[PDB]
Amino acid sequence: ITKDMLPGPYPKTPEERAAAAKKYNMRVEDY
Amino acid sequence: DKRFLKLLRFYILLTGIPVVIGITLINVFIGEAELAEIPEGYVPEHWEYFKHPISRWIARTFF
Amino acid sequence: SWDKDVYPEPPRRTPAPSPQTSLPNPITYLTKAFDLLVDRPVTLVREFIERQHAKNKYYYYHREFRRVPDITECHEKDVLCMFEAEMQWKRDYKVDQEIVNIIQERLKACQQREGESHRQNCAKELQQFTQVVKAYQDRYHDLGAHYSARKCLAKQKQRMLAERKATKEAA
Amino acid sequence: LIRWTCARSANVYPNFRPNTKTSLLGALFGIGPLIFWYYVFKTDRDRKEKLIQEGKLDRTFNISY
Amino acid sequence: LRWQEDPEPEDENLYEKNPDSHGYDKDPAVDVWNMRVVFFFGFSIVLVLGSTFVAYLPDYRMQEWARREAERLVKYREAHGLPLMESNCFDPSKIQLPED
Amino acid sequence: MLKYIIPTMMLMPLTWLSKNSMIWINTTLHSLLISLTSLLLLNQFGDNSLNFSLTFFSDSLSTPLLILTMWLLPLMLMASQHHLSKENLARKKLFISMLILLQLFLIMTFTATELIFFYIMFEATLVPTLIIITRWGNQTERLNAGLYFLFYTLAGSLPLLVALIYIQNTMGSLNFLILQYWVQPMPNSWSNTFMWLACMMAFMVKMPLYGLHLWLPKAHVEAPIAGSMVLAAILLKLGGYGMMRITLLLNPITDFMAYPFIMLSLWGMIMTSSICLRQTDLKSLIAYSSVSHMALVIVAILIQTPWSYMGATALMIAHGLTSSMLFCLANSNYERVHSRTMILARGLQTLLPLMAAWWLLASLTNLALPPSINLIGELFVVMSTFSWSNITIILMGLNMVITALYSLYMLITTQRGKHTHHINNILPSFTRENALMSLHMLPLLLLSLNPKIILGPLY
Amino acid sequence: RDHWIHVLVPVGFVFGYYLDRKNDEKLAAFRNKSLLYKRELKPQEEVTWK
Amino acid sequence: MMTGRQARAPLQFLPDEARSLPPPKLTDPRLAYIGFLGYCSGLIDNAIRRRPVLSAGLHRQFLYITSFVFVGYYLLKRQDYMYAVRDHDMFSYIKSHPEDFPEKDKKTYREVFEEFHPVR
Amino acid sequence: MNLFSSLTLVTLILLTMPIAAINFNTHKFTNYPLYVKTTISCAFITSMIPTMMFIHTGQEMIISNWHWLTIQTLKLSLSFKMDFFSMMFVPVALFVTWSIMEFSMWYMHSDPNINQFFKYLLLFLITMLILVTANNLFQLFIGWEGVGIMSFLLIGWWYGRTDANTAALQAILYNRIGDIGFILAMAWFLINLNTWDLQQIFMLNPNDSNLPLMGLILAATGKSAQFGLHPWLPSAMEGPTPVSALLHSSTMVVAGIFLLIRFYPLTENNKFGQSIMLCLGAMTTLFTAMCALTQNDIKKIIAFSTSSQLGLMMVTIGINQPHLAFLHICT
């Protein structure tokens, strides 16, 4: 486990939302 | 777990059975004291106010 | 045994066995079986142990604390006198605790012994219990966990001021 | 699982903003019950002390406290 | 890349090299003697002798004395008609009240 | 008390001159001998406290805390010798020296006849605990946890220093035996209000009070197992000991200064038990359970009736043994699954049946099953708080319901259900682990037979 | 002694017990002087407690 | 505070009236603690130079112990002297000023009225 | 006197002996369930003699054999009340438990932890006879919490099953809610009467006993599955069948009813408490027997049957007929 696999702040840009949706192992449209 | 229970029971009984047998020997042969009034002019020892022999031994030796 | 004065018991009155039926009751046969199988071997082993006690007799004594000066005749902040007074007060407090325990034992033993007519037949024990709990409550209640002889004397002085004021205003 | 536990405990305060909703929920759920039980127990104990110092509360066999 | 670091060592099993491990040490004689020291000096000494020692404390905080003394005092002041306890802890003769 | 201070200091050459494979066995053996010797402090009297010297004494309050303290050292050495097995020999001897030195500070903390000696020893117990947490703690948060542990205690205790030196200048002495006879009433003023706060807030932090407890579920979690044992079993009870000494001087102002803190603790025992219902960390669940149990001890000291002090000292000893055993059970699973997440290792009764029996008994003592001294202390505190106010029975009963709920939820979550499939390093229970569990539980059960030696100065 | 390290803590306890019994001699200003326990001395006895 | 006392005779470490006082015994626990500090200084001195801690430089460890005991003995003599001076000045000032130290009329607790505050 | 008290204590010590046997074992037993069944049969035999010599005279005694503790005015002793209630409930519970264990030797035969099951079932019996023979509220609380914890351990017997763990935690939840009122009653009697002993409670005989009787009604609602605190008992059918048959039909679930019958000299003098018990028992016996009409699991139907009969027992306590209620327990 490392830093970019831990939860972060609230996503505001859609690429931060896509990176978080990749992080939680789920679809961007379902996240 | 069975080895731990065997060792636990062994190391409890190892001194528990001599303590129980020794307390039985004390309470039969040595035995409990009798409540008497203090004789005149006699100042009792501090361990002579206690009833059971082991309590007397504790209050005499340690306390 | 014990002292029959401090733990009183009214005398036992058991009735004679007056059986009406012809079938033998199992209780007498089990009582004879208890006497033969249990009570006589217990009595023999106890007699052996009592002989071993009688081989070497020795005694323990009741520790007599002589009365030291109490807190009222001790000077303020005089620790050598008020220490002795405080130890006297604490021993008296613990003895009064055991007195209330003895009277509770009398009351509960009376209730069980008198059985169903306990409300009538235990009026004297209830009266003694009410009196000793009144005295204990006037003497030691509401002192707090940091109780001392100073607290108890201050409570007594407050109560005696209240009683003197109530007797003064009634005249 | 590590991500869930780190969200549940270790990442809560860095993702906190003191605003209207959080301050009103922190005042209502934080000092609300304290003030409530304070006035309840203060009312009950003032009533009990007033009945005791008037001799009105029946305290006959109360010697354990 | 990132710096020069040893990898995470695997957690050792005490039962692989010693199937009779009591879990104290990987040296088996040290392990068995730690077992005997722990078991003897805790259970055979402190638990057993302390249960005996607490069991035979010489009238711990004088409760038995206080019961026997209270029996003596009640046996006294029943025979003399005195009340079993006064509501005054101290004699009212030896108390000066504040006058009013 | 010098016959206990000197062997505890002689444990230092005993741990530095021992052979390199013998440094656990020798310290365990001789600390068990000191724990055997601790029982001579039961020479207590109904009127007088056992007063040794000008510096040391022991009433019936300090005596059970002393016996628990001297009993806790071999068990900490047993608990902490497996995860410090691969440690350097010098750092291992330093860990054992910090444990021995913390015991050395505690055994003359509880026996301090004079209160500034109590303060010096009381704040001296921070330094080995801080070194243990911030040095042999496992995760990253141990440094922050050491900061919180240090700077809540000193923030609370440096007003206590000014308060005690003020009492030293006013009464002329901080001897507790002299202050039993020279105590004056503390009337209502703002000066005496802040006097009360300065005398009480340090111990409120150490208990911990609800709202000031935030040092605790980081210091108790991020410590190693010996640190968690000593913090849960003795170092919370330093606060209750100091309260029971220092509330001699704070009358009658405590009778209305206690209300906010009684509200904080009566509501904190509800809130921290509710927090225990929703913990994912098992070790944090035991930490908030410790806050929930010490809230009752705070209420019992602040209402200052005899039943409340008896229940508070019984509950302090009972909670020391129970919480130390719960942390040791948590460590026994952490040394196998390497995670403190409670939902990870499940179904462990299918794998470790006798260790699950130890889980069952520690969860039963946690929920105050009679006739354990847990229930004795719990029950006497409930009696005294009912006599305080009749409406506190609602909060006490609701706390007991939530306490049974999180105790058996902990048991069911870790021990029952289907086991976790992908975990296959679940070793059998070592003899060291089961011996540690039994040396916690068996004194806690034997104390139900003769419970009068843990009911304080006013049994 | 081959096992000389096992007499550090027991001799430490003996030494602490000796120093406690020594300090009890320095705290003897009220030996047989307390109003609760003062008494005439028995023969072949010079102090009431040691 | 006491700086006008030791101003008639300046820079005297131990004055001539310090000899009327009993010296500390050489088995003083304070002086034994200072000797323990000498032993600890010897151990730190062997440790910082990476010598064997208990074995190396026993002459040096012994000179540490001896030097700390030697300094601390005179320090304890001056300590006991200055506290004796403090008590001597206290008692002479109380004796010279009886109007400022009245002998207090001590009442017993039968006359002392303390307000009782119930814990209920 | 000597026969009555001796066989009284020999019954309980005989029931505690197989607990020492299962704890001091090294081998696999020579049929330990047969040993515990034989022990409980012989304990039934031992308990029949004080029952017969109660039926002869009405002989009752208190055995306060062991001084345990004295909290300044509360001398807590190990005290055994051998009255009508103990003399009629101990042989009924031993006879029923003997039949339940001979059923258990057949039903629970393929279980590889059968010795633990018989250990747990005997521990329930020991705690229940601690409850029904106790003379003070502390020892009664010991038996009370003991049958609660053995209820937990025997509902969640198949502990891999989620529903068993859930129903056991449910039963602990409702019983601790009843324990709130139990500890309310203990607190009231200690503060206002300075006792936990039943004798001083009955001899002081308080008049303002509304609040302690409300606490006792809450304790019986938690323990005897009355309305509001009822649903743990139908969930409690998740354990094995002899667990249901012994504990949750006949022996454990009558303990709150036994608690309110045990305080009959206080419930006979309080019409408000009698009305509360009457309305609560009628509510329970309506609602649970109404639930039983359309159930399909057989053990749920019999659990709603026994909670309807507990509601009927609470009714007949409420009509100032406590001995009919205790007769209905033993029936």
Ligand SMILES: CCCCCCCCCCCCCCCCCC(=O)OC[C@H](COP(=O)([O-])OCC(O)COP(=O)([O-])OC[C@@H](COC(=O)CCCCCCCCCCCCCCCCC)OC(=O)CCCCCCCCCCCCCCCCC)OC(=O)CCCCCCCCCCCCCCCCC
């Ligand atoms: C037994 C071994 C077990 C295994 C060994 C290992 C045990 C474990 C390790 C223990 C280590 C030590 C632990 C610390 C404790 C130390 C001892 C102590 O403090 O004891 C305290 C306490 C006081 O002892 P004391 O202060 O020395 O005695 C004071 C007296 O002044 C003195 O009294 P006395 O002088 O008058 O009495 C002297 C007594 C000696 O004293 C003792 O024995 C007492 C000391 C032993 C204590 C052992 C405790 C061990 C634990 C016991 C409990 C668990 C056991 C296992 C499970 C059992 C089943 C449950 O003499 C005898 O026993 C001889 C009489 C025997 C009578 C029976 C036979 C009579 C008929 C014979 C017929 C054949 C011959 C006829 C013809 C002859 C012709 C010549 O002793 C006991 O408690 C003894 C135990 C028995 C008590 C009563 C038992 C029945 C109670 C039933 C009702 C209450 C419970 C109800 C519950 C029901 C369910 C809810």
Ligand SMILES: CCCCCCCCCCCCCCCCCC(=O)OC[C@H](COP(=O)([O-])OC[C@H](O)COP(=O)([O-])OC[C@H](COC(=O)CCCCCCCCCCCCCCCCC)OC(=O)CCCCCCCCCCCCCCCCC)OC(=O)CCCCCCCCCCCCCCCCC
């Ligand atoms: C001073 C002399 C004293 C002598 C008498 C001693 C008095 C009791 C001391 C402590 C007794 C418990 C310790 C053993 C159990 C823990 C380890 C374990 O699991 O063993 C299972 C194991 C047999 O099981 P296994 O199938 O082989 O393996 C385990 C399974 O894998 C899986 O295991 P499992 O789940 O199938 O089985 C566990 C089972 C699970 O069952 C339960 O957890 C149910 C228990 C709670 C409900 C029932 C009890 C409710 C309360 C009523 C009883 C107390 C008052 C009674 C009086 C009348 C009313 C006032 O628990 C039990 O069977 C425990 C029986 C005794 C229960 C005592 C209360 C424990 C509950 C929690 C605290 C309650 C308040 C405190 C009470 C303190 C009373 C003294 O036992 C042994 O091998 C025994 C080893 C040796 C034990 C020695 C105990 C005493 C040591 C003291 C040493 C120093 C003094 C010298 C005297 C020595 C006498 C021998």
Ligand SMILES: CCCCCCCCCCCCCCCCCC(=O)OC[C@H](COP(=O)([O-])OCC[N+](C)(C)C)OC(=O)CCCCCCCCCCCCCCCCC
């Ligand atoms: C102490 C404060 C710190 C706490 C931690 C301490 C850690 C260090 C530990 C040191 C050693 C231990 C010290 C405490 C020891 C406590 C034990 C002790 O001394 O007890 C004395 C108690 C004292 O009882 P007592 O006060 O009545 O003793 C009578 C007094 N004399 C002996 C002088 C006449 O001993 C007993 O009770 C012995 C009774 C016999 C043995 C037990 C029989 C009952 C067992 C169960 C029977 C079946 C019941 C049904 C249930 C079935 C199962 C569910």
Ligand SMILES: CCCCCCCCCCCCCCCCCC(=O)OC[C@H](COP(=O)([O-])OCC[N+](C)(C)C)OC(=O)CCCCCCCCCCCCCCCCC
């Ligand atoms: C855990 C963190 C918080 C800890 C809180 C600790 C308690 C809070 C209150 C502490 C007050 C300061 C100590 C008071 C000592 C009283 C001694 C005394 O004689 O008092 C009577 C004296 C009376 O003066 P006197 O003694 O000179 O006069 C004689 C008495 N009369 C007046 C009757 C003639 O009180 C004072 O002089 C002032 C007392 C109040 C001081 C207020 C300053 C501090 C404010 C609170 C700071 C709290 C910590 C903040 C930082 C936390 C960390 C970042």
Ligand SMILES: CCCCCCCCCCCCCCCCCC(=O)OC[C@H](COP(=O)([O-])OCC[N+](C)(C)C)OC(=O)CCCCCCCCCCCCCCCCC
């Ligand atoms: C198999 C082993 C059994 C024993 C075999 C060997 C002996 C053979 C037969 C002879 C019997 C032994 C000699 C006689 C027995 C001792 C007689 C005696 O005076 O003993 C002293 C006393 C009798 O009481 P006591 O009143 O004299 O002393 C109490 C002590 N003080 C006063 C200091 C408080 O102790 C015992 O007998 C101990 C046995 C206790 C039995 C019950 C254990 C209960 C276990 C659970 C504890 C928790 C309950 C909490 C709740 C209680 C209710 C509120």
